[PDB]
Amino acid sequence: PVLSKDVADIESILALNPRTQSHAALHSTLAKKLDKKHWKRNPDKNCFHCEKLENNFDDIKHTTLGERGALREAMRCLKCADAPCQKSCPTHLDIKSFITSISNKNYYGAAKMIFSDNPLGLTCGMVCPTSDLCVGGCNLYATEEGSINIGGLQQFASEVFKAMNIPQIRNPCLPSQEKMPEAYSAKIALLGAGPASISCASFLARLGYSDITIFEKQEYVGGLSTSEIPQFRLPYDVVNFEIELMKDLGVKIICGKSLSENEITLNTLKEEGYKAAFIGIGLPEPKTDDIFQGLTQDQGFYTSKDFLPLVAKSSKAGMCACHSPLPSIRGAVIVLGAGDTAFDCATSALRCGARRVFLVFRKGFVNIRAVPEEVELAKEEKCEFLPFLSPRKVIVKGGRIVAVQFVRTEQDETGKWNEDEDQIVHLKADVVISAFGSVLRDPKVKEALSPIKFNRWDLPEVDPETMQTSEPWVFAGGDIVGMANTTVESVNDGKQASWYIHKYIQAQYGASVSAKPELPLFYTPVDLVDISVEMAGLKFINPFGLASAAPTTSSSMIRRAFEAGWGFALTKTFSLDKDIVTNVSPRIVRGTTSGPMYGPGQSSFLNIELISEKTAAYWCQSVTELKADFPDNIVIASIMCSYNKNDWMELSRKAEASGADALELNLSSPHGLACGQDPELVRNICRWVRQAVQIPFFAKLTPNVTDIVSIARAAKEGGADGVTATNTVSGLMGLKADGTPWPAVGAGKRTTYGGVSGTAIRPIALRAVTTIARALPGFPILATGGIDSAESGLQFLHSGASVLQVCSAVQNQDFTVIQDYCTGLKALLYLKSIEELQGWDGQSPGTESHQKGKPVPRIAELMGKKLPNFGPYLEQRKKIIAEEKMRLKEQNAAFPPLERKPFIPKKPIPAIKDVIGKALQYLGTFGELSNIEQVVAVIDEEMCINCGKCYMTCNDSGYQAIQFDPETHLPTVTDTCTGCTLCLSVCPIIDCIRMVSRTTPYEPKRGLPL
Amino acid sequence: PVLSKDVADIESILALNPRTQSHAALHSTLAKKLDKKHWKRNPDKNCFHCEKLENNFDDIKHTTLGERGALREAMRCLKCADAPCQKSCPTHLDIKSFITSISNKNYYGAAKMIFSDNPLGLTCGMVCPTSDLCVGGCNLYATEEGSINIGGLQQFASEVFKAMNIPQIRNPCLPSQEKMPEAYSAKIALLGAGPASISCASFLARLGYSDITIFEKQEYVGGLSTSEIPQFRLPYDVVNFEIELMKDLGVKIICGKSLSENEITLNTLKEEGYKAAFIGIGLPEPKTDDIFQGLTQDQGFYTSKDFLPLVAKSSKAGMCACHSPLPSIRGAVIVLGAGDTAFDCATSALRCGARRVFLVFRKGFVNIRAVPEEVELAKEEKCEFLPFLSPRKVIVKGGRIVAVQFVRTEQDETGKWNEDEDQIVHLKADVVISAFGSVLRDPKVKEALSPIKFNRWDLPEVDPETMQTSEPWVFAGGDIVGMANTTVESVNDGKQASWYIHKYIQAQYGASVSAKPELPLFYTPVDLVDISVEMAGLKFINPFGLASAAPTTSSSMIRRAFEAGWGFALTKTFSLDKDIVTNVSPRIVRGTTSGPMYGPGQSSFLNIELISEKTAAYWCQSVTELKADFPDNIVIASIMCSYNKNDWMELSRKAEASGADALELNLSSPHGLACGQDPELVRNICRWVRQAVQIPFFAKLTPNVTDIVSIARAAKEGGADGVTATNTVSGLMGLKADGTPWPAVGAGKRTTYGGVSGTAIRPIALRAVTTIARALPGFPILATGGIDSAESGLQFLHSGASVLQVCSAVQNQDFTVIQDYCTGLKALLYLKSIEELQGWDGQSPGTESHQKGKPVPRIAELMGKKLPNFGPYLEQRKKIIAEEKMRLKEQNAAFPPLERKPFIPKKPIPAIKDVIGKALQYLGTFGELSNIEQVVAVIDEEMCINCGKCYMTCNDSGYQAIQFDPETHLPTVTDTCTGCTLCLSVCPIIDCIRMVSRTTPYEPKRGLPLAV
């Protein structure tokens, strides 16, 4: 047969494989119109009717992210200095830091940083109107691809943290409860269990107050987050999670207790001995219109205050166990108002079975004050919008509303809004919902706030800096104060109040507080994990250090690095005065190793830098100063001489006399040209230094060697106490199209070979560390080469390194990445002790079936029926889903536990010393690998996005083993798979393709039998 | 002094540098409300009134891309098989291939593929309502980050090609014009110079027809693209560009000639010997309403057909011989209708000075015709929308409009639309613009189409597959046929018609055509550039070939690669039968070298794969079959033995006997551990093979050696005819958090050291090629290691290699990348002959000041004033720009553009042999680098997006040399800069930072004085 031709059945599998075209393609406009419908993914501008949404409370947020999407978006963020997104966030979240943690896979560190400044971090990630807050300030707005999805990232890290089931702990910087001053046992009352009080109580408990009680009028907690924000934007279990974290600090909540005249008043709290009160009761009553007087729910009239709590009670499992069914709202629905409460009423009405929804507002579209992302949800669900209409009469016939009569409104040219009595609209409707906003009007409630001063709007007056009312022991915040519009601003109000309540209370007990406000951070048992390590007789407080590189150009930067938390630092390599060098410029350039991607996260750098231009005297004095001021931070002096015994002994003695904890010998000196490339040269250098000094020293090995183990062995034979693996990889980063290099020095555009650093050399450095650790068990290794996160650092520890040197990751960012690395490592260690989470990969949950970060409903009639998410298949999916939601109307939904129990560590948290070298057991020669335990690829069709990359890779780089369906664009791996794993490697969807154990007989294809 | 302590002035420059916090931050809600306005970038939802737009015709497209953004978005595209975006494109653009070209920086290749299927490719990139076309089918809709911006990428690549000023050429496959059959001289008439006829005429010219004339009624060309689509969505210079490309093919345009009775008719056309006619006149008349009868423009009434041409003549230089100012549209404007014409009327009325615009339509929001992107332009410019209103009466007082009276509409229970005579609106207005659509009404024009049949819709009937009317010689397409709603569908109508006009004409001359339509592609002189190369006596038709690797697992795969265009291929390395191997699985994994980015563009792979599992008999028979069928494609047999003279001589002789053009010796065999790591072993292996075979052979070198030049030298000394540099780099690609590796093999989850391939190892391979080329001048080198584009291929050729082997870029994609590589290399070479383009870097234009890929205005009052693009500074920028637009109305603004004259090569096009090794002159030792020719960084404040990364990097990795302003977030480089170049290397904006010569003395910072 013709071996080099595909037989017919492979020709058939290859039918959809890309081919070179030699001609333009002919397809009539009519045929194209018909075919368009088959592939359509997005809304059709020509479908006018609502999708069926009755009883469908699935998440409709455009911002929700899965891990794949969050990692992409977090790597996109520029992680800006003095970031305007944080300036534009009411709780001042350090967005740069938490997004850096997500990009580094440290979801715990991101959550800790979110919740440190916002105790409702998850709620706010889901609901913040970010376009009017943090995202409206984002610098990447100035790029075509646009601002960062900050809320979605916040939601994602916070959801992973919620899944970790880790409790909040008492501020570990506090003395124990019995040694707290009496002031902290002051009885504190908060009124209302909404965002403002939850935040205030949280921060007060962080400060150490131990007698905090929130009194809540209703039988549910969470305020509007629970009672009115729809489940399809804010799942109730988020609210319950955040309140659980609060209760970990000891805050008490008492339901069914009202601030009201014959119940709780400021006076009775005072006589009962309460020392401070926070008023966070919001705006409890609807804004009304006299034309609706006497209308009842039975006739079809609701305020938002009637309607949204009814829908919440039906759709939130355990919010209020008592449920009526979804209100019977079939028919045309009129929603009055253009604030964001109106838009939630409209989309909720659709879930009650509304036939059509009209939002009617009395001004124009330009005057809508709802945030665009709220408006877009009602728009895409095909609500109708009627501007310039003010209601006048509700027509009732047969006990039911049948119509509303409006008059047209208009502006003149003084901005006056007029009502034109001769211009009317008679709009038929079965249900009317007024969403004119909320007010405080209950006389018995206001009476209970006596004698605090109220303003013009009958709201309590506060000092906007302190949140104090006219009574110095009574504070107020959130909606009740009429400043905040949002959850995050209400949270911030309680935060702001908490510091001045603390000041007020301490003053009352005769104590002062800091003039600079100091609210504590958020803490969990993860933060107690010990990440110190001992190596070569040295104690490192954590295993992360600055490599000898641009970030250690000056000793003043090492100082700032130690202040930021770095465990150790190398000096820039320095030499004797006779060997002083002079740098050229340009000399450090971005890598081309991952294509024309600019900005954050460069995959490599190339440098043609030399050793330090600063003198040995500068560095030796600097080491003495640094060791004097930072005795617990390890300082390693990096030094270089030529192949000269007196020089190496002189310089190493000088660095030792300066107080360096250890030395690092830079073996890049030219004497095959480098000393580090010759085992005899390295051994001799190491013996010279070993004779000269008593302190530990480490040989820094170059990777540009045939056998790096032979260099490490020679260092160890010469008396080195360990090795640093590795320096940069020799390379040429690239050429412009005219042939000139980059970096190019001088008018001559000259260059020389540089060293490549960063994540592109990580595989080379990992291989070096592992080969050395296996060949020389127990020999200390300092790892360097592409370390940029706690989890990549843990790879090097697992590979045999004891400490972790960093350069490029700081060049890509700044010194504060150390806080990410330390919290990330603590979390990775803590999680190794949790039985319930062993299916995770470090901080990453097991990947569930998902599309656009939202889980695929587990319905029998969707599973395996070959329905991709486009065209007529997508309309069939929607119908199936819609039918299951109708069918679910009739059945009991379970309750979550009254409140969850955290996962308990089942062994002591591993120390760094427990993880070093643990991966070496899996390494071996090729002959130690089983060639009979083979795998094949299998594709989860529910996660596939139909791109055919697996198919193209298997076709032109594999075994032509995948069928790609010409109608559904769904791939199927067949029995000719050889498990090469290329299709998984190129698939855009994490864990859509999985390698599973091959169940069928596996025969190597020999082409022609031997 | 305390050396390790910042002095007060550095502490000051570091004031905004990030620091670890130990406490939560206290900021009042009121203080936050106040500060939010200082940083605000996007629109403020509390603003009910947007800046003056009078006389502002700057581009408002949200999809426009500069090079930085285009490269990022083109890299995001999955470049899908059988792609649904292409299915959803009416012209069937090969979107996968043109976006692949952009991502590889091959903008010529992208434009060629675009214009091959769509002669109005730049117009369409600008105006296609993609959410209802290609982008509506995009698979990345299923991701949170969403669908690809296909139209912007199409626009970007087409704009670059436009800037190259390269002409279209006559289809180079055709015989010379004198040898063309007489049928191709048939007189062809096209009526109307819009998208439909321009397309049809272009494709007919590609087919070889030499006598094509477009008769256009007006004194301007381009149809609605020119007369109505606003300049702030479609610049007229795009239309002029596409028509000049068509004129390159010899198509003739005659303006001021109408299809109409007593002028051009089908009868007069027939009588004058025209053999085919294409009707592309569009819908020339407005759809009218009786309530507007007698209303004239000076009372304030316009149809869209009156108003939009007025704005266009007044905003498009070069359109029209007469210049004119904008219409005087002051006061409140009512636009009637909700198709996209209405939305262009709304936004255009704002450019004319309207105080207020009302879009009033007779159905609801759910019924708006317009694509959402068109609607959003009006919405964001603060137009008001009034639904459910039907006009009933215009109120005229004092001889002009003062109001329009509407009645409310509603849809009855079934679905029919009623009018509520008693529910009225009296809406004050000064100007009314009806946008009810367009029709063909003129009886003089209809009568000139006698006797073709018309349908119910009063429009010419056509076979929708052929575009033929009832008259066999008359075709029609575009708006006139009533199917197309868009520019791209009208272009497609003309493209569809052109094949069947060709069939009809040929048959009239007694000739047949293929039953399979074969429209030619789009060609320029770039396509004639020769990219062949001779090396070691072998002739390569192009320098790109498949490395010995997974893409050459099977010889059937090589066959398909040669069919796709690949110049050469390696067999997977094979051996004698005694040495047969068996692979494990998993064995090839994605790289972690650039982070958790999945899908296209993996920066590396790692493999633990062995040599081929297929027998030497399979491979030798396959080489014979491949060389029999593909004699012009070079086939190199890659072979491996242990260190054994008889084995190497036997295996190389067997491969020679099978007809391999050459051999490649795989030196990975363990005898360091591998043969290729020892010069003496390599020299002996090459000696053995040289004694065994007469064909050329190449030693494949490993980069995992201290000194690769010594191995290369040993191979040369042993008799090798060249070297392949390099194989994969030894590595481990990483572990899971529980410590298990990936790949993980068997129950024990075991692994071994693997080989790293792909762009991550390109610096290593480039070093090896350059260092061998300098040590061994003229010794042939085959490069492998991260080659994934003509641009990167050219780097290796400049570095001394003659041919270019590829693996990982095909693993990342498929075999068709060869077409991108060849057109890319042709364009790179061609552009070296063009003096006018000396300042480009290859295919990249010199970067100019832009924000969001839109050029920043050149206004003295803006530049140097430290106005960044946010907060109150942005507001001041908008007021300055708006005041400058008022001044361009009130001054001498009118000069049509310089008409294009294509750049002419002013030196020979370099051949491959001319560029090989040209970079080597710039390489040397560090001691050859000047230390007086120092540089400093300087920042272009107009391109800065205020992220402060330059500042952070200089602070914590540099010399604390950048001031970062706390109010404007603008950076300034001070004189302490050392030119290290890190700030440029991390800046997200291409060429915002540039390194320039030091003007002041360069003093090395030494910390303490030297002392002796």
Ligand SMILES: Cc1c[nH]c(=O)[nH]c1=O
């Ligand atoms: C001195 C020196 C400069 N640059 C590097 O990458 N490594 C070194 O050791």
Ligand code: SF4
């Ligand atoms: S021509 Fe239009 S529809 Fe086709 S790919 Fe380009 S933008 Fe999309």
Ligand code: SF4
């Ligand atoms: S890195 Fe670039 S964009 Fe960012 S502040 Fe510096 S110059 Fe501006």
